[PDB]
């Protein structure tokens, strides 16, 4: 018997026997509401995971016993467990880099003073600031060789999803990791993973959505079976570039550390798929409801699952941070976002495809879109993040509200 | 506010008020037994939950709430409508030859619709092309070439390349295993309890998923591919490495000259078939076994049957849960076949495991359990495999399609007892 069917059947008999005055009637009303909500709020996969997890632990018990029997009983248990169970200019650059630890550092100026290499410049600054090159025994040459190839694999002719956007997300993730409420929560390995996930999260982006890649029967959609097409590709390129000569920035980690980092990075870059937004928000919201905070204001994250839920939300929030930056920065990101949408619209036109809603200058409502994006996606996410790390993130939330009102006032 | 927490708090309130509200010996016994039952139900509700099951309830609620807002916004202006379309699409998730071998082939193919077909003989009488031979027989039997306007040339061009992309030098995961799974799926689709339940497109999808489910298999596990830092593991981010690859090859082969067997389907039919096939082949990942078992078990518990009484599967979700379990059961059908067939499959799976062990030895890796040809406990493994995986799955399938599959279950038990009796 499946666990959810068992619980519902016993809750139905409790209700049937409860029926067998104001207090009695008001409670039957509350029971009937909760029992109905229990059923309706369930999906096919939520019901499934309760049952599969139960079945997995039932088999895990039966094999632990079998393992104790003989050397044969042990290899049979190992086979079954592994198969059927789961798991000059440099002066100007130095001046800009003084804002490294600040929200809204001008990354556009960093690009201008680094010969249009903001990703290499910002990643090297972050790694030195955080002492990651010493901690993880990364030679400067290894770091710069990797970063330069990584930057080279970001498309220059794509207006938004280029190395300047990656530099911005990596820098924003670096600032978010420094949140006082999150002091001493993450290991050096988790910090390394988050900044690296942020730097590679859009590498080799063609400047077109996953839906465009699916609809055009692209090699990428074919290879990845229409699931997180781009996000899977960003990871494959990111990890492949480590195999280039003198570029293995993870060469001096232990085998266990590389296994752990790889798992965390995959997890974080897959969470940047925009269609997974509501799942991340639901995870972040449950974390806020059950949050355990210190007297000094520091968050308590006991286990790996809690830490990765926060980290995957951090990289996603960093990816959706343009509306939280000063208006001057935000307006420049919106121009780039729009330019890239229009560029996808051009590719749709050359293919005879139906032009996407925001993909055409004649019909795109730029200001209303920014207001919708903030109201429906950016503000609910950042408000949940701000609740988790209170009072840190209030300035972020204040900047967001100003920018929202500015865009609202700019609607024609 | 997350919904599960809200429900939990509500049921906790009901319980704390039930205690206030509670000859009369029978009343007290009823009052106490129901409180203990409620407490057990509440404890089990919390414990039986996971991080992903709870969050799933919340994300689905958030998705529905936003969809409601966006539907209203789309009615406001042409601008509101394109803003709602942007947000919805981005942030939400939705001739023939006369030969002795040909006469022998026609004789074997008389058992096409039977669980008792010998695929080893089909391979021998078809120039070691069991996949093309069996798929062509299935497609003609079911009239799929006429229904979906597939010319024989296109069909045979595709099937031949598909068969060519199965490795000959791999003992188990070759075209003979694919032919076996496709034929077993064809038989399972014909179960009387599942009569007129599936559309022609769903039938096409299941047989196609079964035929392509192991294409280009290197004869090594996903764990071997992850541990050796293979290109495949790198490409697929260590998740269902092989299963993703089987699908990519299977769909890529349609692009070969005059091999597009889906060329005359509508765009909507190709979209639906593609979705179903991906779903079915990803479900063949053995590490997903307990999820499929869980889904099949819930389906048995809530099963509705007509006057006939043929199974009733109202929506698509129910239909795909059965179909992915069917292809998985077909993939785990070797122990349910006659002993003569089963013993030949066991030799092949062992030979493949040992070939992997040789690769681990040459690489200086620790030899995987079952991969050492010198230490493998072949019989005990077959007993464990049946007791823990094959029998629980087939027993659940038999409950769903009762009384059909009783013979499948009887054989499984005989083969298990035979292997048990053969333990040295
Ligand atoms: Mg992205
Ligand atoms: Mg397989
Ligand atoms: Na470039
Ligand atoms: Na071959
Ligand atoms: Zn060098
Ligand atoms: Zn991004
Ligand atoms: Zn198979």
The CATH class of chain A turns out to be: Mainly Alpha
The small molecules bound here are: magnesium ion, sodium ion, zinc ion
- Total tally of structural domains of chain A: 1
Oligomer: homodimer
Write down the CATH topology of chain A. Catalytic domain of cyclic nucleotide phosphodiesterase 4b2b
Query: DSSP helix count of chain A?
Result: 20
Run of helices and strands of chain A: HHHHHHHHHHHHHHHHHHHH
Globally, the shape of chain A reads globular
* CATH homologous superfamily designation of chain A: 3'5'-cyclic nucleotide phosphodiesterase, catalytic domain
Major sheet details of chain A: none
Please identify the structural class of chain A as seen in this structure: mainly alpha
Distance between the termini of chain A: 60 Å
Strand content of chain A: under 5%
Would you report the number of β strands of chain A? 0
Chain pair with largest interface: A-B, 103 and 102 residues
Gyration radius over CA of chain A: 25 Å
In the CATH classification, which architecture of chain A applies?
A: Orthogonal Bundle
Helix content of chain A: 55-70%
